[PDB]
Design a protein around this nucleic acid. Sequence first.
RNA 1: AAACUCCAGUUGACACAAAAUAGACUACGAAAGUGGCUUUAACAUAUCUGAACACACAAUAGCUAAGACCCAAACUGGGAUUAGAUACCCCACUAUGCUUAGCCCUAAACCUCAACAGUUAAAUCAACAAAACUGCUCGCCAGAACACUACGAGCCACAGCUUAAAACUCAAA
Lengths: 128, 23, 137, 86, 97, 48, 122, 74, 72, 117
Amino acid sequence: DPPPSTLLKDYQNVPGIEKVDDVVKRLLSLEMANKKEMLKIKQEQFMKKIVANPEDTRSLEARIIALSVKIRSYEEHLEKHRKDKAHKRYLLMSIDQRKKMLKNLRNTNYDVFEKICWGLGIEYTFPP
Amino acid sequence: KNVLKIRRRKMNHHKYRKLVKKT
Amino acid sequence: TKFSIYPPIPGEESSLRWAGKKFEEIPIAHIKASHNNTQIQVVSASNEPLAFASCGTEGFRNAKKGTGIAAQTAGIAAAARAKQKGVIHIRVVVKGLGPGRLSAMHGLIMGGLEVISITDNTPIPHXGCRPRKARKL
Amino acid sequence: AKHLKFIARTVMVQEGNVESAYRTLNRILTMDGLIEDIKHRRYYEKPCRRRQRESYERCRRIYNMEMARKINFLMRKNRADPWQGC
Amino acid sequence: SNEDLPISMENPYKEPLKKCILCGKHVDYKNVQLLSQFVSPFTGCIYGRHITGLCGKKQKEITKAIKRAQIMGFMPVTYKDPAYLKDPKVCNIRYRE
Amino acid sequence: REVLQLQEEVKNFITRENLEARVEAALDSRKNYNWAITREGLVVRPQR
Amino acid sequence: PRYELALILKAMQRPETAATLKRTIEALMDRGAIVRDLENLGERALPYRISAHSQQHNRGGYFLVDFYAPTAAVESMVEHLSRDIDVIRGNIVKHPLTQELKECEGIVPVPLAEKLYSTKKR
Amino acid sequence: RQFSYLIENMARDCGEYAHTRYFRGGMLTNARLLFGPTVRLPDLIIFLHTLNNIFEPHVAVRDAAKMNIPTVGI
Amino acid sequence: YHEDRIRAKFYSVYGSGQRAFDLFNPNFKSTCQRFVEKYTELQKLGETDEEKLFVETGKALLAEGVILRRVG
Amino acid sequence: ATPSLRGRLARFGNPRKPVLKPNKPLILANRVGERRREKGEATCITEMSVMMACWKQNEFRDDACRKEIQGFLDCAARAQEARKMRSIQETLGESGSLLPNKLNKLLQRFPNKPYLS
RNA sequence: AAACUCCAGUUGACACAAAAUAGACUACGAAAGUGGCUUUAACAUAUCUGAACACACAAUAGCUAAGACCCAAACUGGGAUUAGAUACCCCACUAUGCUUAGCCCUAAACCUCAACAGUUAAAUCAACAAAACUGCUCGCCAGAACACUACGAGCCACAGCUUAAAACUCAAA
Ligand code: FES
Ligand SMILES: [K+]
Ligand SMILES: [K+]
Ligand SMILES: [K+]
Ligand SMILES: [Mg+2]
Ligand SMILES: [Mg+2]
Ligand SMILES: [Mg+2]
Ligand SMILES: [Mg+2]
Ligand SMILES: [Mg+2]
Ligand SMILES: [Mg+2]
Ligand SMILES: [Mg+2]
Ligand SMILES: [Mg+2]
Ligand SMILES: [Mg+2]
Ligand SMILES: [Mg+2]
Ligand SMILES: [Mg+2]
Ligand SMILES: [Mg+2]
Ligand SMILES: [Mg+2]
Ligand SMILES: [Mg+2]
Ligand SMILES: [Mg+2]
Ligand SMILES: [Mg+2]
Ligand SMILES: [Mg+2]
Ligand SMILES: [Mg+2]
């Protein structure tokens, strides 16, 4: 996970954010935000690492990355809430949706499919 | 609609459960 | 001053008096109007029992206890014993929707007591214990 | 139990008129729904039975309020016949 | 063509939409005085929107605020705080004949 | 504009330095959240 | 996030109340909170009798503490307030000023539902 | 009924016929039984009001078409 | 009609004229219609602003002796 | 204001489950119900108990209960004449709201039209 | 009538139970379900369709083990009624309803109306119900009864569940 001192995605590109008081830097960091703000930082790191245009969010690559971050958040939730059947359903459906995305990406752009698998650590498997 | 079809199934099931209990 | 149906709040300065006593000092007549009986207890403002009467203690039995005339008789009996101890004005607190809900209050008035206020305290759980199952009649 | 006493559901008697005070109290408990609530709680109403009763009472309100609105709308027409004989 | 023909446009005589008495105001669970204006004086029961005249959004906010204020120790449950009995009567209900 | 506003508010926050002074200042003041509404939609602040 | 601590303290004299507020604000700071303000709502009579720490209370001092804290600090602070004998009741809610009220255009009227039954003759 | 008197006078003045009253079942479709086997029906029916007093079409509109009588109507 | 916007504003500012409509006269002119005609004349003289063209019309009628009591 | 009926019934196009399950179509009839016959309260029952109270204390001797017997008699006569007038006034005049018969005649003239014409 | 009579009423202290009013609102969730308060996490998918069995769920009742127990309550016991009363009515009390950990996998699980896209014109349409249709896809159906059955197979299920016939019979259902 990103360090707690990481600034929110909205206040990371405001001019002069490095010269404010330390208290102001805490109030604008991940430490003082909910987990959803931390996931937006994780999603941004994967984009710059993998996709060619980190600003295009509608490409099949960005969608696989966005969904992979949601999948990891469901796995962390279920590690603490093992009888939460609702989120167990959301996890299994999200894994199925990502596999369908990967299938379509493997068929259309193999070079991008290989970089996604390496970047996200996904081991593609063929169905039975 | 009447429940005559249900009633036939009702008695069938009652007699079957009673037969199983008896044997 | 116009009449106020809201009771005087303790701690505030009200001008209402009853024989020189404030609303907080008037004895209380607790009426429990059940479906099959009516019980009346008169207590002082300090919770000192002054008189008790029910349809059962007045010689009524079985279905006759669950009537208005039985509750009226119990109200007269409680008022008689309370009036001997120096009670004139009372605050009525009634709980239950039994047949002796209003009749018990008439008996208290017929017995010589003056009702200055009426309060309902019928227990209503806000969600509580599950009541018994419905009857097949 | 933990609240102050002689505030809730309390009505003061005026000029010894205990009957009018009791009717005021009964009208208060009725309008706030406490009377019908107490009666329905004497025996347990099963959930499916409560849902059926609520649906029946809601359909009755809609019908009664629409019939009342039509009666008030047509009441002006209850005047005398202006073209008697034709 | 013809100058006297009607023209297509929005109703100019259309009256502005009506607003509830709380439209645009913040409902706080600490403002017990405001919350008390929507409960019964005798039983503390919350009034329905057909009595309070509030819109759906504010009827919900008032309801949630009352339930919060009651269990957090700000507002009584079984009656209306007598200190607020002389506030403006905004609800449509009368108990005395 | 939100970082500037926040940078001025932090000056008035409570710290371990002014904690004892800010507690005494709170015991001397009163904050009132009560106000009533009228049938016309007007706020009626409390008489204080 | 930004929270609001509704604090009802036992009716005490000024010195003991100041010691309780300081002890409570420090408990927030020890858990990583940034305390923003402290408001005194005044001492009043409780809406109902409250029993807390083997004692019955009829009056209390109402105080508010606006502060920021990590999400994990709330659960730990709730446990701390449960053990302080001078606290009658303490609740932590998300600060109401963070929730921005959406604009309202007014009341949109609802017309009587139509075509609920076929127009055949009955 | 507001114009019954006006219409009856207009019909009498132009030398024609008026029926502003309650319309009995079969005045047109059963006329030979109601009036006689040699009765002559109207060649034209003019409705100054095509609705009856419950806001439904006057029964004579349908019955005029059944008897193949042309109708003028406001 | 275009003039309906002028009428809606006139009724909101000056309310319905205390003068009574006479719908039997086919050539009746109300205070609002007299306001609409003056408003239209001034608009044909080049003026295009709305808020300004509405205040000048009221002055012209007052000079002619018309009673315009603002509702608020 | 009448409660809404939008999206309350099980219909095609309404996704949600039904809110209402009316056992009769929600369509206004062309008549109202007949007012139910009501049971009045007993009159002079207070004077009746006062009379029967003196009897119990005077061995049912009418000579000692004249004032109580007379009061119960006068009340019964007054309650008799009032009962005689309540019919002439309330049954015939139709005070306040109309009677069902008269109100149904008014609905006959403006029947509900659940069909097209 | 039985039952209780360490009973009842007022007052005070006092839940591993249940959640008046709001709700005349019609929201959330895949469905089952979800209406006391707070906080944390959190409600898949930028084409659609796609499974008795794969994968994950699934009211109530029920099973196994350990706890809690106000109230309710199958069974059972007592009282009454009756020709009889293994019922309906009254009283008492248990399994059970709750928590924890595992099972079981059913419902008139029905809004008896499959998902997605589109239409209100034509012939509007057997009847009733909740107007009539088009495109596309999956699932399912082919007289009644035998039959929520037999057999086989699978299953933590052993008086269970799922899948599910035939012979004899009738000319109707
Ligand atoms: S109408 Fe705007 S909040 Fe109620
Ligand atoms: K509740
Ligand atoms: K099924
Ligand atoms: K159903
Ligand atoms: Mg039937
Ligand atoms: Mg059979
Ligand atoms: Mg039906
Ligand atoms: Mg309700
Ligand atoms: Mg699919
Ligand atoms: Mg298959
Ligand atoms: Mg199945
Ligand atoms: Mg289950
Ligand atoms: Mg269980
Ligand atoms: Mg019990
Ligand atoms: Mg038990
Ligand atoms: Mg529980
Ligand atoms: Mg269901
Ligand atoms: Mg399907
Ligand atoms: Mg067959
Ligand atoms: Mg079965
Ligand atoms: Mg089987
Ligand atoms: Mg087998």
